[PDB]
Amino acid sequence: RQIVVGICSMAKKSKSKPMKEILERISLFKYITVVVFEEEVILNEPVENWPLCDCLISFHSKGFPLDKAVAYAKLRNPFVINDLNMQYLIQDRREVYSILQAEGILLPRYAILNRDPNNPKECNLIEGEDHVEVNGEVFQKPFVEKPVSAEDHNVYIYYPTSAGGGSQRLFRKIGSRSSVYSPESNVRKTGSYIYEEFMPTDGTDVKVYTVGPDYAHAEARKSPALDGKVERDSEGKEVRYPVILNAREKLIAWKVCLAFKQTVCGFDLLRANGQSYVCDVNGFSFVKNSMKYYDDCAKILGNIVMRELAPQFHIPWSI
Ligand SMILES: Nc1ncnc2c1ncn2[C@@H]1O[C@H](COP(=O)(O)OP(=O)(O)O)[C@@H](O)[C@H]1O
Ligand SMILES: [Mg+2]
Ligand SMILES: [Mg+2]
Ligand SMILES: [Mg+2]
Fold first, then answer.
1. Residue 293, helix vs strand vs coil
2. Are 113 and 135 in contact (CB under 8 A)?
3. Which CATH number goes with the domain that contains 61?
4. How far apart are CA 128 and CA 126, in angstroms?
C-alpha cells in the first residue's frame, strides 16, 4: 500500500511544466503515489467527494477556492506541506509585513494607509511635492506605493523632483515590459496602500525559493524599478543572474519558510546598504528551467513525506 500525495491547485498550476517535472520525480519514490486533483472537481464537487490523500500539497492562486481546501484538510486531516490558513494572510501585504516584523526580519521602513472607500479624503495622508506623510510618518521621495492586496502587482515608485519627478508604474510582466514611466507625480487617491522607503540595490532583485527551511535556491533578475524593459535570451527566456545566499540570508529563508508555514515558499530580497531586506512573500513557488532544482526539490519533498509518514505505514525509513 502506497502513501498518497495529493496535489490541489488550479489547472494552470497543476499542469505547469515545473509542476510536472517535480511530480514525475516524486513518483519515483517506491512507496509514494501522486494524485493530482482535477480542476473541475476542486471547483464543482463538494470536498466530501475529493480524492483521499495522506499528504496534501495545496496552494491558492487566482480563482482557487481556499475555503474548500481548508474544509477538505479539516475533513481528512492529511499531513499538510504548505499551511492553508496562512494563505489567507499571504494575500494581504499588511499581514505579510506584520509577520516579518514579528520574526525580527529586516524589511523596508513602511506605513499602512487604510482608506475608507466611502470617505476617501478622511484617511491619514498628507502630500507634498517631494514627500508623503502617512499616519504622521514622513516618506521622502523616492518611495514605493503597494496595493494592500498582494495579488495586485500595480506597485508604483515615485521619483524625487531632483530626478525629474513622475513615477514608475510596475505591473505583471507583459511580453517585453515590466514597468513604464508616468509623468504623474502625485500618489493614487483611491484604494488602500502600503508606503515604504525605497531601498537602493545594484539594479537587481534577488528571488529566493525555499524547499523546507534548510534549502533555498536564489537567483537575480533586473529590477522593474529601473526602466522596465525585460531582458531576454536567445530562446526568449528572461535573463537571470547567479546568486549564492550569505549566512544572514540563509537564516532569513529559514525564518520565512517557518513563519509562514510554507514548505515551498518564494520571497524577494533587496540587497541594499550592506544588508538584505525582504519586500515580498509569495508562498508556493517553483524555480523554472533548472534541472538541479527539479531534482533537489522532488528529493526533499519525498524525503519529508517519508520521514513523517513511513512509521504509520510500517515502511522502513532510516533517520
Ligand atoms: N522598498 C522597495 N525598494 C526598492 N524596490 C522595491 C521596494 N519594494 C518593492 N520594490 C521593487 O518593486 C518590485 C515589486 O514589488 P513587490 O513587493 O515584489 O511586489 P509584487 O508582489 O507585485 O511582486 C520588487 O521586485 C522590487 O524591484
Ligand atoms: Mg512511486
Ligand atoms: Mg515581488
Ligand atoms: Mg508578490
1. helix
2. yes
3. 3.40.50.11950
4. 7
Beta strands 3-8 and 55-58 are: parallel
List the shell of residues around ion ligand 3, using CB closer than 5 Å: 268, 280
Compute how many other C-beta atoms are within 10 angstroms of the C-beta atom of residue 253.
24
Q: Are residues 213 and 247 in the same domain?
A: yes
Q: Is 285 assigned to a binding site?
A: yes
Count of structural domains, the chain = 2
- Residue 42 cell numbers, joined: 476542486
Grid cell for residue 44: 464543482
Mutate to test the pocket of ligand 1, among 134, 151, 268, 284 (most ligand atoms within 8 A of CB): 268
Is-contact 5 305, C-beta < 8 A? yes
- Nearest ligand, measured from the Cα of 155: 1
Rounded Cα distance between 148 and 155, Å, is 10
Side chain identity at residue 221, one-letter code: R
DSSP string, 7-34: EES-HHHHTSHHHHHHHHHHTTSTTEEE
CA nearest to 139, candidates 127, 148, 149: 127
Instruction: For residue 92, give every residue at least 6 positions away whose Cβ sits within 8 Å of its Cβ, in sequence order, or none.
Output: 148, 149, 150
Which of 160, 157, 162, 127 has the alpha carbon at shortest distance from 141? 160
Containing domain of residue 108, as a range? 84-285
Angle at 152 between CA 6 and CA 74, to 5 degrees: 30
| Structure's resolution in angstroms | 1.7
The best mutation among 193, 279, 284, 285 to test binding of ligand 1, ranked by most ligand atoms within 8 Å of the C-beta, falls on: 279
Which grid cell is 147?
496595493
Please indicate, yes or no, whether residues 248 and 217 belong to a single structural domain of this protein. Answer: yes
